[model samples]
Target: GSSGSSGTKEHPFKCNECGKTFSHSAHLSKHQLIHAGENPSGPSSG
Candidate 1:
């Protein structure tokens, strides 16, 4: 049988506001700032 893996390397956390996704909710939360125009932080990737 194949190795038991599911959704590997998948950025499942998606933002419907912009249709973007990150591998984890943490990144998605940080990224959500852009839609709210609250990106007071330095940079964003993906």
Candidate 2:
């Protein structure tokens, strides 16, 4: 299977744990919220 290519504003990687995907590494790091005990859709400070 392919993880997809990078360089676009679209998902490049998919999380096998949550089935979530992200475009960039930074986005994937951010998307790890669900595993980090935080809700991605919740409001936050800074």
Candidate 3:
């Protein structure tokens, strides 16, 4: 669950790692992967 909105132009989903805000919780979740050092492997590397 995430804070829906601040009832203004500000986005409420804040990242603890970098204090970045995302308009959507899903976007925040995806951004968190960077903090975990998780990235999609490229076909060349596979």
Best of the candidates, TM-score: 3
Please, what are the lDDT tens digits per residue for candidate 2 over residues 1-46?
5454664535657776787777677877777766777755547666
User: If scored against the real structure, what TM-score would every candidate get?
Assistant: 0.54, 0.44, 0.59
Candidate scoring better on TM-score of 1 and 3 = 3
- State candidate 1's TM-score: 0.54
Those runs of model 2 whose alpha carbons end farther than 4 Å from true positions after fitting are: 1-10, 39-46
Cα lDDT computed for each candidate against the true fold: 0.76, 0.67, 0.82
> How does model 3 fare in lDDT?
0.82
| Model 3: lowest-lDDT 10 consecutive positions | 1-10
- Model 3 stretches astray by more than 4 angstroms: 1-9, 39-46
Single out the weakest 10-residue window by summed lDDT for candidate 1. Answer: 1-10
For model 2, which pairs clash?
Answer: none
State each model's C-alpha RMSD to the native: 6.9, 7.7, 8.2
Candidate 1 lDDT, 1-46, residue by residue in tens:
6543755545668798988778789999988877886647567656
In model 1, how large is the Cα lDDT of residue 23?
Answer: 78
Clash numbers, per candidate: 0, 0, 0
State the lDDT of candidate 3 residue by residue for 1-46, as single tens digits: 6554556547768899998989999999999989996866566452
